[model samples]
Target chain A: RVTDEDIKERLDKIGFRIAVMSGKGGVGKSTVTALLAVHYAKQGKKVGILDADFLGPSIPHLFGLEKGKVAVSDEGLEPVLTQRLGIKVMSIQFLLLIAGMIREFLGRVAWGELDYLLIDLPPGTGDAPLTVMQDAKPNGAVIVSTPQELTAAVVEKAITMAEQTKTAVLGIVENMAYFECPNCGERTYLFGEGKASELARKYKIEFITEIPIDSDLLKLSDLGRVEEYEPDWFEFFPYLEHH
Target chain B: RVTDEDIKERLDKIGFRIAVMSGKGGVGKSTVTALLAVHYAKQGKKVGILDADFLGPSIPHLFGLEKGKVAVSDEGLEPVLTQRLGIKVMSIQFLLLIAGMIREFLGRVAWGELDYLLIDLPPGTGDAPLTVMQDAKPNGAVIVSTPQELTAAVVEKAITMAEQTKTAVLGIVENMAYFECPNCGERTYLFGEGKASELARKYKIEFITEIPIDSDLLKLSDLGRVEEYEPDWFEFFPYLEHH
Candidate 1:
């Protein structure tokens, strides 16, 4: 019953579709994706996060929305909204379908008109989730990665996967790119420097920003309070217009 | 024509089968797995590394063996050996089969005789690789993790997966547990502390050792020279007395 047409009918209400993707875990892919979603929601963009990386620590955990439950109503599947900003979140854990796509499942979600739907793509190959992505035709991909050559070597796979699937590579977010010593005001490329930019240049994508490895961020992570922290790197993101 | 029996017959020559498992990427899982493999090899143990995490930064990348090519010989599949210690490394990239196991394809690998076979299990769910692990009847698992609560939460899945599959979790290694300020002789719990220990205690598994974030290690990691550096944490590894 959930055909691509049914999914497309529901998806028509959402204005933008961008996937927050990564090569591996610990690249801050989920966190970065949620932060972007949170930013857009704060700007009153009416954001919805479709967590395609359901098997790992996903969007719900980031927003402390794990306690929220999804329910079926006359409209379809109702997404669990977060506590603070009331951002809509839907994890693929319930669906448990690898080859399944948003077009397939969103036909069930009673998602009203929304500005953006940021999808947290699965790590590793990030291949299967693309079924959902390709079905819905994502507007672009924001690839999250660290600067380490080892990590970039994998992150490249994500970039290439997006390219192969015809998803526009909007930009790259080099997370935990460096650690600045607060006391000395000295900076160290904790993972490495230039790899992300080098990667950006190599692949002809925009280098979005570098999120530092900060104690504050780690504290917020430990406290499960990412929303409380200011994403200073937010300024460097791509423009979100076309309201 | 390869069957499980053929796989089991070849695997019989391996003295010990231990898997280095993790929940997500970027927990230093690959590096830790390689370092442990390196340590065992230096101790005069004939070791083989099966890079089951083929999609991510795999074992070949760790040993700087990315340039080596895999081949099929009369004996079986020939895994590429490392430059220094000659650790035979095989990645799952070639086969491109998910449900398949080492029992199926490894029957081709002419792994002559291995004292210890260290498998770097896939990140994320690490589910598919379990087909290989369960098939091989691994002796135990060395779970690698960081102290970050977010990371630990996902890592527990790997632990439970190992548990559910009846794989013995011999111990856990907390990599990047902390960083020491060489100038001040002070230490900072960079990610956090006690989480890994608590996880170990909760699971009733040994807390093997904490590998500190060292400049030397980072430098070597950047240089692709893991073999040149010393793994002080190597001292606390599980005993390899059987050989």
Candidate 2:
């Protein structure tokens, strides 16, 4: 068994924290995590995302790169750096064995490397999310939800999970707050109204943001070329400052 | 150019949202994504983590699959699904002619037959994060952060990005919360006290989980074996009920 000192020493050397979560599905949680990493990369910060959401891993295509090799060494694992982003990244997909021994090979090299890692967990708190949190201690977590009753309830379950973990809650994000009417250019509240704010107040949390569902997101993501979106995809993040 | 309807159709067919991120280099962000997919296979989730982090490509190792095997089809770009996870995963690592070629490719796909999909994002706020956000349109996100100033700040930047993208911020998780003193069993606050809580309050978010800084995380990640660690792993996240 490894001692805490050794673990602490290893962690101190790397230096990064991250938590991306959502109570329900279809609330655009993964995209937000990606956008955040992109925003920081523009500033030339060293960063990365951790893919723990085993259900649907989508980080690779967002950057327009897929299926590359990651080099490992005695010093540590090396993340495949993208074009000019100047960030290091690591993932579980890069370490497991393919056709070889089942328990022997895939059971090793599950962790290591990167500066700022984000863990993208699956929907509904379960074994996957719990396992990751306990093994890899994150700094904080963010909740994703759409302003809808069904989604909100699921998000509530996630809230309960966070409280049980003693993980510091970052804030809540209201995705698809409104949908813009294509013909009139006016915003329409498709899902529901005031759901995010209501939850925020109920939880007594302050860091809440309202983001409308836009046409640009849909077009960009499906093409597997989200990075190619004009005006810099997700560049609007820095402007979301709290009062 | 793809229409909004087309994008939505494809996304709906692909039902999984995993936000892959990291705190700093050498933390195994990509590896985590792959491992989660493995777990999904064990649970019958039919998972996938899109490698949206264009800056650093990591996802493919957890399956131990090779490059050039990931191919595109009418349904979508088929990910090399290893038997370990029994799921389909997409990433930029598979497309690049070289690891540095993450910036050039821009192809679209129609997702089909995926029960769950995770997004393995590149580190920091840059192109990769945004791409994942727009493409995945996740149900929820899972963030990963470690116990360090730089890591914390970077992870926070990613959260801010989520807000801007209108993506749901699920919850904030503190990756490396503290180290436990085995002898005295004293909890040592290595990074700082209430950093996650302070940020969560400022952001008005909930679900704050503190994961201890352990070298075993690296060891487990490096070995590519995260199956048996679920029990110990869950010790970090319980339920985040922040007020």
Candidate 3:
């Protein structure tokens, strides 16, 4: 394993390193990572994203960079820059390893300088996130969850894992928390509500934000145009500003 | 590892064994498992569910048996029987191993005679599902997904994995396919629509059914009263009939 000095050499260039994780899968943890990265990029912050979910790497697909490739140079591996927002992106698919891989990964990425580096971890309190906490020493973690009790129950485990690892849990993001009807502008809590805030209160962490179910956002993510779509929903997030 | 013969000897006593899994996490795979088990149990079928997801065991939470414990007996182990519908449940939390664990799990559970045994697998085409397919030899697999492109993309990977494993993918169930507004009876495709069916056609598998986002259903799952509530939304699935 590479020493922490190797990791600090790379991470030190980034202003803030935030890892996005979930206690369970399919909670839009990856989507949140992409959106948060794009949001920072839109604000003119130099941003880079590392997709650490090796088994199911989705950042390339979400960004419409399916055929994107990482470049190798004398310094190290160069992250694939997005066409729209110029956000630098990388995925485990390009590296294909875990654990110590995170150490070498951050060590090798030519991060140069970035306002934020968002790492999208695979769901669960597994090796990837654990290793990220140990190596990257993220400024904070953003836990993505739904409003359902099942989601909350598992998310609690994730929060406990974060606390155990001595990583500050910045906040929780409630994704798919509600559905807003287009025709009549109605609001429906499709999966229930306030569960994430409840979890935050229990853990004494910040309640980050809530992302509603938006068909347009879904389509935009499908088309890899996440950079163009701007939603004011994230303004309430205390962590939205570049660190 | 226990011999396949040992696993079959126990599985032989069950009428049908089916595995429910997702290519990604947080798609309500566990909720679907609990609801399907409750649905079959409501129809007077002898149903038992195995929570194969060890890392994030959700069956107990979904069934409102968070404080439940596994009972060890001379026969082996007694699956927790739900209070409302008597649906027998087992989770990996009690049996915290994979692969050979399945054989011993099935062998030990004193499942007298079950009409259906549902296995809730962890997300992705990983070791757990692969092991379950190899040892459990489920009669069919129900792949769960959402209508979003990212979910469909990974779900296609799951279908391909099932095919490569020589397992029959029963069909794809699109969860969160739409949001039915309570006030005005309008159905909005919250995550966009037709992705699951398209994936089904692409793989030449049956498109099972679409599950809408229901608030009452979410609440029932939260309160562990899933068996008390019933919706007629699953009639379209061919596999809905008692096995």
Candidate 4:
């Protein structure tokens, strides 16, 4: 069990902490997280990421660090740095701790002097993410969801979870929001739109961004070079402050 | 703890049992389960679905039964049937039990005879789904995923899980496999294709169906009339056998 002072001491060096969460799986939550990490790092921000998806860790894979392993030091476990963007990264699989030990170990992960620490959470409003929200006390959380009401209905549960835990919701990112026809540049609301914004309005949080379905994004993700892949669709993300 | 005989006696009346699972969330796992339940019931099959997603119970919401509640009976708890299709359904929240208790109570869920009993599992290869797999011992599991390698990478974990638990993998269904343009009627591989089929072949399971992104499908899902949404995208699902 980590004391209050211990958690503050371990995490005080980080300027900001954010958790990227989704109510259901396969809404590209991990990709959104990696994109945020990469986007901030490209702008010369000192960024760190923790892949808290214990069952399905994809941050390593996103950064092309599948073969990468975390390093241990006197302070705590050191996050693996990406070669392209030099972003610090860690995954729960590196330690594979017992139940109670997860929240404790996550607090002490040797993230020294980072401007932002992004936690890619597992799907659902379950014990693990709840524990992280409690222990980390993140500055805010960004909920990722698709444009479908099926997903929005589930994402609402996650938003309520944040409210219940007293965590601030920064915004909602509507991923797979639409598909832009390559031939005519026509935008097709494949799943539908404004669902995330509606969710944001209902929850009274910021509506962050709408990410279209791009083949290039898929290709970049497959190559594990998401850092280098420039998203031409969006002009800028709302909350990406340099601080 | 439920005795093996007790589990058998409880679930033995069900003809065929299947689980809809994904290694990660947001691949429309719950929606697919609802679709299957509705699809079979529309054909006059006695269908039942157990929403095993303890944290995020969406089966009820998808079926437009959010206000629906389980009833206590002499036998146990009774599952709510959909008003439209009369598909019997139960969520883990109906009883809300611990790990051991989950396996125990699930077996005794007062499910009458069912032609097909589909279990809608929570995302990932966790203890909950693992427990369900072991205790329920479903005839097979139908893995759900998108056509992205990122999703496929995590899906491998679920496949490994089924293999480890000695669960039969009935087949793989690729949801959001592509987008059919509304204007020109052209089909775009938004996330790319053949990933699920490749995974199916690698694991030696049948490739079930490739469901395209349809706006009408989402609309019906939102209105809780997904039972009426007939998908013309696929010719037929491989495992939709009456027996």
Interface RMSD of each: 3.2, 24.6, 2.1, 2.4
Ranking by lDDT: 3, 4, 1, 2
Q: Candidate 2 chain B, which ten residues in sequence have the lowest lDDT sum?
A: B97-106
Each prediction's TM-score against the native? 0.74, 0.43, 0.78, 0.72
lDDT of each: 0.72, 0.54, 0.76, 0.74
Fnat of all models, as shown = 0.17, 0.00, 0.62, 0.45
Candidate 1 vs candidate 2: the lDDT winner is: 1
**lDDT (tens digit, per residue) of candidate 1 on A1-243:** 588677777878888888887666777888898788878877777998888775575677667665756788888789888777888888865443556655545677877889888888777564666565666567788888766643556666766677656778888788877655555555566647567776777778764678877767777755656677676566666775524
Q: Which ten residues in a row have the lowest lDDT in candidate 3 chain A?
A: A234-243
- Cα-based lDDT at residue A181, candidate 3: 81
State the RMSD for candidate 1.
5.2
lDDT of 2 by residue, A48-154 (tens): 66556556566665665465566766644455555546444444455441111111111232234345556666554665566556655666677776655325566
Q: Can you write out model 4's per-residue Cα lDDT over B35-149, one digit (the tens) per residue? A: 8787778767799998888767778877788766778798777888888888888875554355555565556677788888898887766776787776666767888877763
For model 4, name the residue pairs that clash: A24-B26, A25-B25, A25-B26, A26-B25, A26-B26
TM-score winner, 3 or 4: 3
DockQ of each: 0.23, 0.01, 0.46, 0.34
